[PDB]
Write a protein that binds this ligand. Structure first.
Ligand code: CL
Ligand code: CL
Ligand code: CL
Lengths: 191, 192, 189, 191
């Protein structure tokens, strides 16, 4: 049970990468047997009241105090089956290089988000990008597009890509933008 | 509501505290809370629901309820539960018999564990109408709002969480029947 | 004086009101009595939780007002929005006509699946318009025209269940019979 | 310089009530996401969804008044302008809200007439004539509501956006559009 101590120290070290990717509300269905119903609802309420990142921070607070045998592997499995293969792979090997290399394109898309909202319609490329987002994120993007309009939906799409753990989502996005012939492709340089 | 009757009413509430806090959202009996509780205590209970969730709000509501002394607080509580829709929970408290609510535990755990498969194969728009009498009236309304603002998986998860907290003795069977009408991949996983 | 008495009756009957009233339909009449934040909080509650939770929040605010004439503004707003039945009940504090509808609220709740399968709102919406708020009829038509018959049929069923019109069950029977629909055989009043 | 920061904070605090009646911060967050913490950005978005624009703007100002990085104020002005808040930008930049105060009379009149507006105006008829007075994303949300919930729902959303418009002449543009459509509401809206 020194492995656990080493596992706890590393999570705190990499909490800034984790909270930038993980929306814990998406992996609570795979971890419900490890958390109290009250803890599940507190994490869910924190997401609705403050956002994904603070919800992830609270989820880690609970995660770092668990003691049952195998709590860490349960987290890895929950991440994987929810769709966080990239984040799961990074945590399992404590190597965030593939996620660090994405920082440049996280900064670029966030800086260019106004042009993104002005020139991209999520209804045109969401299917091509469904391998870079959690299935529920794609569902929320379509509902927002259907209730609030194109610009509102495009912003949700941009925010979801920024938190994607797929090492090549910038290239996936470039290909989708070119297939639809979008003014934004001229602003998106991958290779 | 003498001294020997409050003690029995208090003893009964604590005896079933885990059954109550797993079913009751005190936000739904707010007209009872405001006429029997201090206004400040009501707002703390409301803050607890918004900030922590229904279960923590129910736990806090019970703390206040167990300290009341006013005449008729217990029977008023039962009356509130019934008119809110908590017929099963109200019927259980009056007769100290939670057998019908205990038989549901088997299906509460099953749906909780199978929640990923539920969200993946079920659309509340297909079964919400069939399941209305198993949920509180406000729960049906929030399920549709979530379904329309966040999508199918989000609405399905809220529905599953509301079924888990249902006190209707036969909601597992009603759910199975609705699932069969649509011929859904989840029916093979839901045995009653 | 009468404010204090009117305040006490609202709390007594709040649960009947929030079963009928969607405050989103009377906020255009009441914005001068509520802070802008309170108006928008009620609107967000409607979008996030539904009419009933929005009505509960509106009543909490309404029960703390003190300005002169807030109650009379509420009655008039109910009328101009279309809540004639609910307005008539509040003026006399007699909810017998709305209580008597509970039997048919439960029946239409039971039969909503059969309703969605056999009823087209485009056929009876006009006959039932005086049982619904005008804005509800518009949303039923938008749903019917964008999402299909069942979606509009479900929206209609949910709106009738919340109707304060004392004779909407009989109006529904007659309209369904006028069109000769398979659901009329299950709807007898 | 700290002097300019200090003076800019006092003036923002001085006008916080004019700002929070016009500014929906969700519309200028894409231009300022680089100046706020990810947590602060998402909390502002949750506040909009949970409480509305005014509470979101009030929360946004609390964060704005604690910034210290070089150029945060000019970034705020740039975000406002390019989002479409030219009038509010002109008012904040020059500390003159005369044009926005002069609108108070017509904000009150339209709000009072909101029932008559919803009953006689269809956004499909005047939205194009009025798009100059509204944020581009507001026009998209008006059409989505108009197309999913109907005319009265869209008409009320339209009035709410006009009420928060920072264009000094939106009352006159509305009158002209209502006359072009020959609308029952024109008899109630002059000047
Ligand atoms: Cl209430
Ligand atoms: Cl536009
Ligand atoms: Cl002009």
């Amino acid at each position: 049970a020194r492995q656990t101590a080493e596992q706890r120290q590393n999570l705190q070290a990499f909490r800034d990468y984790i909270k930038k990717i993980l929306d814990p509300t998406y992996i609570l269905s795979y971890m419900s047997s490890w958390l109290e119903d009250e803890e599940v609802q507190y994490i869910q309420a924190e997401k609705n009241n403050k956002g994904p990142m603070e919800a992830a921070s609270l989820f880690l607070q609970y995660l770092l105090k668990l003691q049952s045998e195998g709590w860490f592997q349960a987290f890895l499995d929950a991440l994987y089956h929810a769709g966080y293969c990239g984040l799961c792979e990074a945590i399992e090997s404590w190597d965030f290089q593939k996620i660090e290399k994405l920082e440049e394109h996280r900064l670029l898309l966030r800086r260019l988000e106004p042009e993104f909202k002005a020139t991209v319609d999520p209804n045109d490329i969401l299917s091509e990008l469904s391998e870079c987002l959690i299935n529920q994120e794609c569902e929320e993007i379509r509902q927002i597009r259907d209730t609030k309009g194109r610009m509102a939906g495009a912003e949700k799409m941009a925010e979801c890509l920024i938190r994607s753990d797929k090492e090549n989502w910038p290239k996936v996005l470039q290909l989708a933008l070119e297939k639809d012939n979008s003014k934004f492709s001229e602003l998106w340089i991958v290779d």
